[PDB]
Coordinates of C-alpha atoms and ligand atoms in Angstrom, one line a residue:
Chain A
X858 CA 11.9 -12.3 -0.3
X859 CA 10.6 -13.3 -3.3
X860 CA 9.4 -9.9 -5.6
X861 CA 7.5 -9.6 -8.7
X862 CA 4.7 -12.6 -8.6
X863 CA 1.2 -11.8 -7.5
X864 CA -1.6 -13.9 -7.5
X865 CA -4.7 -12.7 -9.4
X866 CA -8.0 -14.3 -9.3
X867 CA -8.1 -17.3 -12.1
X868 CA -8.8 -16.1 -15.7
X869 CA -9.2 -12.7 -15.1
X870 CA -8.1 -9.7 -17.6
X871 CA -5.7 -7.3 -16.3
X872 CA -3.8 -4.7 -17.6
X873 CA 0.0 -4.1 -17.5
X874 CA 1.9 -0.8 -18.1
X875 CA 5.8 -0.5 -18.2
X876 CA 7.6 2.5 -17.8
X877 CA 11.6 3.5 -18.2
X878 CA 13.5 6.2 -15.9
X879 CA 17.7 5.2 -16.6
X880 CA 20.1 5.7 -19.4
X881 CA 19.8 1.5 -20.4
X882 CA 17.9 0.1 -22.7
X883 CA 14.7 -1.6 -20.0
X884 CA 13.5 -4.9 -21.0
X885 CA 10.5 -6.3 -19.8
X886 CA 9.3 -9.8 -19.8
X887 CA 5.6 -10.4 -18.3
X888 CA 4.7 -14.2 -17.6
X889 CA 1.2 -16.2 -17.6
X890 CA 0.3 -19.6 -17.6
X891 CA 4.6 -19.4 -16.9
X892 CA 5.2 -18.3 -20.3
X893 CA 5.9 -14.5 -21.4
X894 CA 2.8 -13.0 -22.6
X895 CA 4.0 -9.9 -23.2
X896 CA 7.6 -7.8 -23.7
X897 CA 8.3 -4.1 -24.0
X898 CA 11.9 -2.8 -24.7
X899 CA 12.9 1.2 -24.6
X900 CA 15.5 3.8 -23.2
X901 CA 13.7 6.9 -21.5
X902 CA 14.6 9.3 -18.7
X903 CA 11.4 10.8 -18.8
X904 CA 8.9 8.4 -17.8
X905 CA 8.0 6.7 -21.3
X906 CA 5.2 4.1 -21.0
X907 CA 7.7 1.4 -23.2
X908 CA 4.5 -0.8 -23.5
X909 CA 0.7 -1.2 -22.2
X910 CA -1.2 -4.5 -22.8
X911 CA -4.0 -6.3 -21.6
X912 CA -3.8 -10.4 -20.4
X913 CA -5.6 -13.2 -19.1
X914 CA -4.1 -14.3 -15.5
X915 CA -5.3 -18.1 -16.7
X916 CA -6.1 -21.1 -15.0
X917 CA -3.2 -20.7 -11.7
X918 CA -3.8 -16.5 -11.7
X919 CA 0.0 -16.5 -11.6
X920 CA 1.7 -13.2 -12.8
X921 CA 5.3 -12.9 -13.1
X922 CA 7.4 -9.6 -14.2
X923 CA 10.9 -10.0 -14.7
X924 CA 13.1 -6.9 -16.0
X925 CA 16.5 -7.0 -17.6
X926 CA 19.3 -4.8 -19.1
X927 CA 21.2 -6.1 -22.2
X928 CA 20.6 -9.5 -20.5
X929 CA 21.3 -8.4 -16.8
X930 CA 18.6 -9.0 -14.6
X931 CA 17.7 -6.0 -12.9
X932 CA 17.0 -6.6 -8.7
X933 CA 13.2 -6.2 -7.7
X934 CA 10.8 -4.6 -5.9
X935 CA 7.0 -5.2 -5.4
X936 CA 3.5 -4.9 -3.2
X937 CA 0.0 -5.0 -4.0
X938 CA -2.5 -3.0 -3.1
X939 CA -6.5 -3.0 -2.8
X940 CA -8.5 -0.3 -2.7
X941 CA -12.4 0.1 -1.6
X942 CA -12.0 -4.1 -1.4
X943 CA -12.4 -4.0 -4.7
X944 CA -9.9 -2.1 -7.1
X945 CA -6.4 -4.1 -7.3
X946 CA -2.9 -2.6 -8.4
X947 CA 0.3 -4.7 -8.2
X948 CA 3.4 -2.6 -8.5
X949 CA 6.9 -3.2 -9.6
X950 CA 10.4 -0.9 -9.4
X951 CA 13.6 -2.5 -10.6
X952 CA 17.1 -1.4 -10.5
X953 CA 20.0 -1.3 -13.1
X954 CA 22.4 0.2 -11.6
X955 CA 23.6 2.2 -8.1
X956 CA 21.8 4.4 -7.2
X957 CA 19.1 2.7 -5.2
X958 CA 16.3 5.0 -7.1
X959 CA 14.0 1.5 -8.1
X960 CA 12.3 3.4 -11.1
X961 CA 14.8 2.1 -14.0
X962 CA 11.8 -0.1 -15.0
X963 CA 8.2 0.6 -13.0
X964 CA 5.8 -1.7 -13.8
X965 CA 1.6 -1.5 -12.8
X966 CA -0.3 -4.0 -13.1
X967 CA -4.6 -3.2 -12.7
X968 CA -7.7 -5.3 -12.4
X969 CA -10.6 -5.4 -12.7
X970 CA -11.0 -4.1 -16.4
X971 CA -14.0 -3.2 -18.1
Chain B
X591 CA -12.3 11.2 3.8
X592 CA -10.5 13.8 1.1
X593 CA -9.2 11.5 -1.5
X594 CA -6.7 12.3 -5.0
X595 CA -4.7 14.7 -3.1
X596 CA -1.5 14.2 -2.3
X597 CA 1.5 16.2 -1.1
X598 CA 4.9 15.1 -3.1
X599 CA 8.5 16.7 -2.3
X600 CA 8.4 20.0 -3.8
X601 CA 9.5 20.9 -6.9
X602 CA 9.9 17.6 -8.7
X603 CA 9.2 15.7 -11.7
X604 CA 6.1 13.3 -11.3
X605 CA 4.7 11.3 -14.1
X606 CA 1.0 11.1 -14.4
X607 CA -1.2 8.2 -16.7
X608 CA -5.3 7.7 -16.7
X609 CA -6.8 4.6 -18.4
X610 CA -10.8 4.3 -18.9
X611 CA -12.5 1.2 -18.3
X612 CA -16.6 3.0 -19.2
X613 CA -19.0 3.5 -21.2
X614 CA -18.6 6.9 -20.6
X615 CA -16.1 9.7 -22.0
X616 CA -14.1 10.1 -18.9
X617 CA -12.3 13.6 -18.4
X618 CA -9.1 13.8 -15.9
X619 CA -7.7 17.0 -14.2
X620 CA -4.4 16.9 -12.9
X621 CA -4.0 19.8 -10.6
X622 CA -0.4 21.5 -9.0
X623 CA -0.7 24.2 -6.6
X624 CA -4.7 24.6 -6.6
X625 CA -4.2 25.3 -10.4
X626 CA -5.3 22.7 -13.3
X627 CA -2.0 21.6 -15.0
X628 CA -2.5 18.8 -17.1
X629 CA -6.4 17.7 -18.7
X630 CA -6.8 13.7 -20.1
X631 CA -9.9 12.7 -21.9
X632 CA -11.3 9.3 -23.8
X633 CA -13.0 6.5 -23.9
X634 CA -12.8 2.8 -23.6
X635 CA -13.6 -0.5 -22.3
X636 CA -10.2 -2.1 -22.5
X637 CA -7.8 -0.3 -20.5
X638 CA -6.8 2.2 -22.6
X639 CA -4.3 4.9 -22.1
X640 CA -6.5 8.3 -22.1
X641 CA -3.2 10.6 -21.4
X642 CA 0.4 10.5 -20.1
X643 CA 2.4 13.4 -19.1
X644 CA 5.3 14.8 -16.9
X645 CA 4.9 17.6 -14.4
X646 CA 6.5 19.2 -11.9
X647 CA 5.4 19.3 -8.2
X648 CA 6.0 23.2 -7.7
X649 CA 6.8 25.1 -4.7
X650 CA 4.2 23.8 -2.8
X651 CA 4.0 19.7 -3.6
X652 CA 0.5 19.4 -3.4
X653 CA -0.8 18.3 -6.8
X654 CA -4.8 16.9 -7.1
X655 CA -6.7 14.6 -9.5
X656 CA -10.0 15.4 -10.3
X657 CA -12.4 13.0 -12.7
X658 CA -15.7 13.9 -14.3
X659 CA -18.3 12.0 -16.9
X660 CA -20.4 14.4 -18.8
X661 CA -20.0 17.0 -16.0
X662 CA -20.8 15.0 -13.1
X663 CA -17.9 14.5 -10.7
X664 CA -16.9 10.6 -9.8
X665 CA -16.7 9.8 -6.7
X666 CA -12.7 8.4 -5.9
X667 CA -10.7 6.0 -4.0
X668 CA -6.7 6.9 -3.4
X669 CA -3.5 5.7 -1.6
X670 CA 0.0 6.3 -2.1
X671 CA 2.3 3.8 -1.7
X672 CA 6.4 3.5 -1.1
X673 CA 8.8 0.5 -1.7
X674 CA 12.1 0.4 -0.6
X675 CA 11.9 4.0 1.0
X676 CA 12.3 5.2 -2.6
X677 CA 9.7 4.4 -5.3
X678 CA 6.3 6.1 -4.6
X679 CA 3.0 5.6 -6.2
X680 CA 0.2 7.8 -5.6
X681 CA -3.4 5.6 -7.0
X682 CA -6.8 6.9 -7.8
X683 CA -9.7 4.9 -9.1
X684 CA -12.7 6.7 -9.4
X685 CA -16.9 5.5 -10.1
X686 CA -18.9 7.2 -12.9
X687 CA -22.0 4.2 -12.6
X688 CA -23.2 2.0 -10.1
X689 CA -21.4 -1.4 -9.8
X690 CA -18.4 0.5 -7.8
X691 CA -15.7 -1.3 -9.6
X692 CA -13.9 2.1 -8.9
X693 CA -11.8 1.4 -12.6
X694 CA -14.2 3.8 -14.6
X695 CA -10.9 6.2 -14.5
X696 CA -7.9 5.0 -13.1
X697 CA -4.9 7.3 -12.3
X698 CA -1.1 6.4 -11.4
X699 CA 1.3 9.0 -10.1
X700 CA 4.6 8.4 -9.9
X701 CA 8.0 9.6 -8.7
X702 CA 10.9 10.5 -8.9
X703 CA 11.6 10.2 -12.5
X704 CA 14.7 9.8 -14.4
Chain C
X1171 CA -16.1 5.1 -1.2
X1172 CA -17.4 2.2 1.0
X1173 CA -14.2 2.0 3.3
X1174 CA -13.2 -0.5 6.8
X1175 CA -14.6 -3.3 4.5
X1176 CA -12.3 -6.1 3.8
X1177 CA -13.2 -9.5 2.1
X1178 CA -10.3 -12.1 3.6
X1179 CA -9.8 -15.8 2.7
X1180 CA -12.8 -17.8 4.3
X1181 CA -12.3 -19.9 7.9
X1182 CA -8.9 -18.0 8.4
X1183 CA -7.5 -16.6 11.7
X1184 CA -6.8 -13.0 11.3
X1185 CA -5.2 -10.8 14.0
X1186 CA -7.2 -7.0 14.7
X1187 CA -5.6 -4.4 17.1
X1188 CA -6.6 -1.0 17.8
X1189 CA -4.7 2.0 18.7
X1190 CA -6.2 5.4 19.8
X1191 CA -5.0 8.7 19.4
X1192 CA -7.2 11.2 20.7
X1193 CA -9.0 13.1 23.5
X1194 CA -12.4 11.0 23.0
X1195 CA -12.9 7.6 24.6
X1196 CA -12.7 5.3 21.1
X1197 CA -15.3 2.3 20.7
X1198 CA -14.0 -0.2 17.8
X1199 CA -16.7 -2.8 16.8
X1200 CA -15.2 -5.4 14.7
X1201 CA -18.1 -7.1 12.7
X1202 CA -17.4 -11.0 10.8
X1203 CA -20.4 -11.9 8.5
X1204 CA -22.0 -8.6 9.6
X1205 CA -22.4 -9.6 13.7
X1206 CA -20.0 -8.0 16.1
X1207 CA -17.0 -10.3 17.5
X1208 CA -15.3 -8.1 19.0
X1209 CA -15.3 -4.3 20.6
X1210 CA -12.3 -2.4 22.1
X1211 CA -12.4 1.0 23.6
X1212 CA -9.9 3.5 25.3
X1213 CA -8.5 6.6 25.1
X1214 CA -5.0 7.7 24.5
X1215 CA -3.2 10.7 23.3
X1216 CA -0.1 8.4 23.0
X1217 CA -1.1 5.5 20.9
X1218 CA -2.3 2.8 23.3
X1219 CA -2.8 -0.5 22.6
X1220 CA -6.8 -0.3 23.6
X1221 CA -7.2 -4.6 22.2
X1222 CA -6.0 -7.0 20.6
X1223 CA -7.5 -10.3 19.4
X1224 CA -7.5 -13.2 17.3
X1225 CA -10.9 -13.7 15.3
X1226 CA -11.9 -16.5 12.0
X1227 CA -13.2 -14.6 8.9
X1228 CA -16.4 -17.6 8.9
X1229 CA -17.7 -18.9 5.6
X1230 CA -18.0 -15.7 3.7
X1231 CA -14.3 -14.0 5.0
X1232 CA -16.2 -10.3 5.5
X1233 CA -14.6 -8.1 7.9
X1234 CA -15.9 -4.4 8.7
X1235 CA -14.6 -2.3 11.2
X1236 CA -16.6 0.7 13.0
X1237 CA -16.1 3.5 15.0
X1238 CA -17.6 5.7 17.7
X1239 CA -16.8 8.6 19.8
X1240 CA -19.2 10.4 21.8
X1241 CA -22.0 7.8 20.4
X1242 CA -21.2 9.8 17.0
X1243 CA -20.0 7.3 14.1
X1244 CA -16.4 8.5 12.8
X1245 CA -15.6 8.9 8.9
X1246 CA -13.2 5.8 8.0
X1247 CA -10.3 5.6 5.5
X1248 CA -8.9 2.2 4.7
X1249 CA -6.6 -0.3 2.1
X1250 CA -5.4 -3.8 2.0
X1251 CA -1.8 -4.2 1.1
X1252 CA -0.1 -7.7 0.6
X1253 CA 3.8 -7.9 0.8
X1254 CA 5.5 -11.4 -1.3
X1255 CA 2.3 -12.2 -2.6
X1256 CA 1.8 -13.8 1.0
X1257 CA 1.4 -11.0 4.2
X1258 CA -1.5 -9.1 4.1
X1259 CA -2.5 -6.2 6.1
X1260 CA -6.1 -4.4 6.0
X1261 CA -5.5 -0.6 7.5
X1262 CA -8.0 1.9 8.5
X1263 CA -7.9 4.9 10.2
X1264 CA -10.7 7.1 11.8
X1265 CA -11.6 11.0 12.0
X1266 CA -13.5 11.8 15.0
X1267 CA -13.2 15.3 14.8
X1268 CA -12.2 18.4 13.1
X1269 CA -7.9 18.0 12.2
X1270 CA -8.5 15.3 9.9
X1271 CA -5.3 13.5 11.4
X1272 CA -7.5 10.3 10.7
X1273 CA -5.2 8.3 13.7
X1274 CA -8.1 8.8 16.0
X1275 CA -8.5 5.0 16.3
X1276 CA -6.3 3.0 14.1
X1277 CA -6.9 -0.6 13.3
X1278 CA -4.8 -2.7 11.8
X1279 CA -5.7 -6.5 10.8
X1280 CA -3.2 -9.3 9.7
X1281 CA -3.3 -12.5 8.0
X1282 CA -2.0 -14.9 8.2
X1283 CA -1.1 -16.3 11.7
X1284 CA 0.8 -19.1 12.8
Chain D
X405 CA 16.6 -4.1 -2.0
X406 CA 16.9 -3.0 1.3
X407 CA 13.8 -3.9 3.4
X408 CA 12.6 -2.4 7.1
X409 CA 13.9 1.0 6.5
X410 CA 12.1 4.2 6.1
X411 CA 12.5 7.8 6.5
X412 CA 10.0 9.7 8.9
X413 CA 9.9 13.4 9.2
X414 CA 12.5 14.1 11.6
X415 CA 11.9 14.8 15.1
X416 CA 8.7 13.2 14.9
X417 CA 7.0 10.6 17.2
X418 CA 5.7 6.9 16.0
X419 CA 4.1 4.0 17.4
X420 CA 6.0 1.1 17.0
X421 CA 3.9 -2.7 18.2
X422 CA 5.5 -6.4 17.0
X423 CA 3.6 -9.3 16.8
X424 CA 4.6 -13.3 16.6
X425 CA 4.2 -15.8 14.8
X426 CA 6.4 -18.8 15.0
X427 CA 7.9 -21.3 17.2
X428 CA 11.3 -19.2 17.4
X429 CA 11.8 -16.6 20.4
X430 CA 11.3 -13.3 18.1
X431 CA 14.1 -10.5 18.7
X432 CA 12.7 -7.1 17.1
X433 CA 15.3 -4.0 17.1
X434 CA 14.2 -1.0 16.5
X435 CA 17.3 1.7 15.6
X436 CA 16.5 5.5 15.1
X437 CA 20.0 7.7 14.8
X438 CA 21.5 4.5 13.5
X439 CA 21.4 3.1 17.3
X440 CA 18.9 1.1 18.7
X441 CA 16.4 2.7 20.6
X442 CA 14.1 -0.5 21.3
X443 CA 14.1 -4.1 21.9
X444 CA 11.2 -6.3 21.9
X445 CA 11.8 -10.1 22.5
X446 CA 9.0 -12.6 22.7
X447 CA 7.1 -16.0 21.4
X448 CA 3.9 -16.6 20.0
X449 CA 2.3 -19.1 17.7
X450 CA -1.1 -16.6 18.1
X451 CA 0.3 -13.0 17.2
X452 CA 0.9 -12.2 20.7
X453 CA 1.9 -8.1 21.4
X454 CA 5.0 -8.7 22.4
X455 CA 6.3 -5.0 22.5
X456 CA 4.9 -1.5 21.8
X457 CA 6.3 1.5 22.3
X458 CA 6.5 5.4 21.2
X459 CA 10.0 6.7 19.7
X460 CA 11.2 9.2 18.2
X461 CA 12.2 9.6 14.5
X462 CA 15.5 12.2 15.5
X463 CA 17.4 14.4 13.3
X464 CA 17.7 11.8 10.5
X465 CA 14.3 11.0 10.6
X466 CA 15.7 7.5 9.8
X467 CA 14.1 4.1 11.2
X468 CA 15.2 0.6 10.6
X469 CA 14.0 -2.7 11.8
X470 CA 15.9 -5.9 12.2
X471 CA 14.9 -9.2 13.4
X472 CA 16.7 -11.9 14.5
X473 CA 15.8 -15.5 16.3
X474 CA 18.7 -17.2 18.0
X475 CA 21.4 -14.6 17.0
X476 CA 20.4 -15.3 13.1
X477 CA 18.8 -12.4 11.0
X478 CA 15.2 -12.9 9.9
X479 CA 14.8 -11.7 5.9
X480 CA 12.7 -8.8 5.4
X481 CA 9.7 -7.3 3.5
X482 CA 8.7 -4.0 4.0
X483 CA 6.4 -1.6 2.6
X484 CA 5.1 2.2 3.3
X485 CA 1.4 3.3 2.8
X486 CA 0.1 6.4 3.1
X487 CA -3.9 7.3 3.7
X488 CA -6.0 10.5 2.9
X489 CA -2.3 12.1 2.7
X490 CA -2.8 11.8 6.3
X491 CA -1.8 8.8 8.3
X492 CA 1.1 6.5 7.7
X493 CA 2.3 3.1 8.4
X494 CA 5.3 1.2 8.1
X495 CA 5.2 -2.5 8.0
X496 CA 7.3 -4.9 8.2
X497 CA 6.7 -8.9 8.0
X498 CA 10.0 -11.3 8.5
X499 CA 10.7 -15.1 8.2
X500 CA 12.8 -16.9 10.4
X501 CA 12.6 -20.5 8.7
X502 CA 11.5 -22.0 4.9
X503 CA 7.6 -21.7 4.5
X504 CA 7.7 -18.4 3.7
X505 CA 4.9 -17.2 5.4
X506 CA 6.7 -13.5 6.4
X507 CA 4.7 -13.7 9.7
X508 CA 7.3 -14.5 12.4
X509 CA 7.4 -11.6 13.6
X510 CA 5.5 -8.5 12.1
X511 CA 5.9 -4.8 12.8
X512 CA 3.7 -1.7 12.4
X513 CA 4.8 1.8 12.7
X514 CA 2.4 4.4 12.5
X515 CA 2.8 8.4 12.9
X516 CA 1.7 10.9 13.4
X517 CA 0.1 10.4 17.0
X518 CA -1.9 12.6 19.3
Ligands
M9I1782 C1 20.5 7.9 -15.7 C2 20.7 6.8 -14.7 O1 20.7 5.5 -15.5 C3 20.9 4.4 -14.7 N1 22.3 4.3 -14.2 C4 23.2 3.5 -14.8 O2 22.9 2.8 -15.8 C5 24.5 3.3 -14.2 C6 25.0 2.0 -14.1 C7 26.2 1.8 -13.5 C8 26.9 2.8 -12.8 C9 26.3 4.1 -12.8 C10 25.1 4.3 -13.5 C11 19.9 4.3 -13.5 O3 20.1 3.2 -12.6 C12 19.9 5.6 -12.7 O4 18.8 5.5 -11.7 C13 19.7 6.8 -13.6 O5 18.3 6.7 -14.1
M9I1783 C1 -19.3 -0.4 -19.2 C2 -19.7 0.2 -17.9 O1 -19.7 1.7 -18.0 C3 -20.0 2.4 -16.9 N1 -21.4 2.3 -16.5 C4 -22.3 3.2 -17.0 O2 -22.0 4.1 -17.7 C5 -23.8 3.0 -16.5 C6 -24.9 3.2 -17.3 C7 -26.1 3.1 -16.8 C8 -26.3 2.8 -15.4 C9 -25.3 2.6 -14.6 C10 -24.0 2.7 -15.1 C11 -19.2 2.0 -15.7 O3 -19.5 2.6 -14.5 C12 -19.2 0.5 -15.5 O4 -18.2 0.1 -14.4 C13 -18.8 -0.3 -16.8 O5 -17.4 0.1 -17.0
M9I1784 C1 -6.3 15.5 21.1 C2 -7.2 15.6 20.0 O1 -8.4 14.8 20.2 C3 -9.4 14.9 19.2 N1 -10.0 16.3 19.1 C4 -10.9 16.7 20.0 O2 -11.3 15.9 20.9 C5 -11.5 18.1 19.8 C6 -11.6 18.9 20.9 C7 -12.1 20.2 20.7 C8 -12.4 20.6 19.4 C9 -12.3 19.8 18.3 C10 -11.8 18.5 18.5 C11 -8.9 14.4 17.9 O3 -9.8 14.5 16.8 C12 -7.6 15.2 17.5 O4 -7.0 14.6 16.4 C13 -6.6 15.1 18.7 O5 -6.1 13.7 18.8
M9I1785 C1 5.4 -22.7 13.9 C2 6.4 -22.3 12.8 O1 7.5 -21.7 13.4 C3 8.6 -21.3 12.5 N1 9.3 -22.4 11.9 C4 10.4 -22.8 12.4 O2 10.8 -22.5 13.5 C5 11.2 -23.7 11.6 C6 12.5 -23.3 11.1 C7 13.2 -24.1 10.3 C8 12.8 -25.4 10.0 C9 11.5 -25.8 10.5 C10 10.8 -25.0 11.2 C11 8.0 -20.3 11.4 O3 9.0 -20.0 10.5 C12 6.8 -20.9 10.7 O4 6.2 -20.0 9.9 C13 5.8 -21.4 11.8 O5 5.2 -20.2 12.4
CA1786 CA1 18.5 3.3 -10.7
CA1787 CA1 16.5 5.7 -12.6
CA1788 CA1 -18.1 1.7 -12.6
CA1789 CA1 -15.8 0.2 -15.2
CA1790 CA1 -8.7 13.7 14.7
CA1791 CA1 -5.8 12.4 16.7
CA1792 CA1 7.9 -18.5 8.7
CA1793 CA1 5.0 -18.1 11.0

């Protein structure tokens, strides 16, 4: 299935957070409107936040995160989930490698802001 | 329901992050075994990264998030999540005011690291 | 927290099922645009099946789940989590007691169908 | 990544309940010890039940789901949550054919019981 696109209401802020757990360099792309709107880069093993940014979901609400490694796409993994019907988090693991751990790249994404 | 605690395998790394979407200076406790281990405080409106920081679960697992404005206590709103029976999330939002967006203080555990 | 309140798309099908899970006879009411629709009950120790049924959110897609034991309201924990952007499921579980096992009566609704 | 498995605590009893949605005769295997310990087969356009059942998690503490329609495998997505550190469900949507809708047939596992 399909991993890393989530839906958010039309032209609403949200906030995205990256974070790096493997000995390669993470790359992450985030798309709005289809178009990246925002990349972080880094090598951590101890849970750096590589980037944090706030966005505008646009006119379709469509969100994309796509993670590579040197220019290796890294294989995805992603829910979303709502909390008191109101409080919205769409998360993101990625791997790079073998060991099946899915926190080389963790991406969360949170709305509403403000 | 009890909500912000949560029991992770024992003696492991967990990577802890608050953002503040208030008015209000909002003040985070992070605690491990009954005992405050990591304290986050700021402001903003925007989304903003009031503290990161790596701890470790402990003997026991059991690790606690606690949020106060001014000395009042919010009231929260958690779940912990898993994808692919590896990458676990542990969410709290939390209300300072009285629109329940539940943002006021957000917290994202997550785990393993590295 | 507010919690067993879900706002689904409006006119859709959704699925609700209850399972119970404790010594008390369970009475799930099932409320669309704040009317019952539907009400199971049963008790089981082992996780019955007490109903099942198909219902349409209406024009303003708000669901809320309640329960009873012993004509005493139980204390309600609840999320929505969507899988591919596309699978939604709105959980809650129910504390009728003292154990906190919150499994009491579990309700679980699904969109979409078809 | 791997999708429709997940690791109980051993020894431990769960609820497992499928649902269909789709023209194709659903075929829902349920393995625990790496054999399958459950077999639900059914058709429904209107999330019919068609299987629930209690097993046992075993030594492993490993579950797996696999659907199939007509001897082919169904793709999987697959998700844990966890509420009030309490109650737990496993849940699993599948798609047999090209709209995507992950609905053919969709599982729910929930421990603990009683
Ligand atoms: C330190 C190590 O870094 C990566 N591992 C590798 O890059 C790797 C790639 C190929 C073969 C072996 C290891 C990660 O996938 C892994 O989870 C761990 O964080
Ligand atoms: C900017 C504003 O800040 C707080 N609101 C208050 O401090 C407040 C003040 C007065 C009355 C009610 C609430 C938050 O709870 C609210 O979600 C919003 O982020
Ligand atoms: C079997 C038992 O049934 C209820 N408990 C009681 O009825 C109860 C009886 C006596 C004292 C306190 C509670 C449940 O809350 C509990 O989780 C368990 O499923
Ligand atoms: C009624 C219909 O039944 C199946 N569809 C098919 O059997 C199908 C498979 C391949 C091509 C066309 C149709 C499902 O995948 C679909 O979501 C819908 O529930
Ligand atoms: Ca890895
Ligand atoms: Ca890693
Ligand atoms: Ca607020
Ligand atoms: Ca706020
Ligand atoms: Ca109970
Ligand atoms: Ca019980
Ligand atoms: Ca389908
Ligand atoms: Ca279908």
């Amino acid at each position: 299935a399909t991993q890393g696109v989530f839906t958010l209401p039309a032209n609403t802020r949200f906030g995205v957070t990256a974070f790096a757990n493997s000995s390669g360099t993470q790359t992450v792309n985030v798309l709005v409107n289809n178009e990246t709107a925002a990349t972080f880069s880094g090598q951590s093993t101890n849970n750096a936040v590589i980037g944090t940014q706030v966005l505008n979901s646009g006119s379709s609400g469509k969100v994309q995160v796509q993670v590579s490694v040197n220019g290796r796409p890294s294989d995805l993994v992603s829910a979303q989930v709502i909390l008191t019907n109101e409080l919205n988090f769409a998360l993101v693991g990625s791997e790079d490698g073998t060991d099946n751990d899915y926190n080389d790249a963790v991406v969360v994404i949170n709305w509403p802001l403000g």
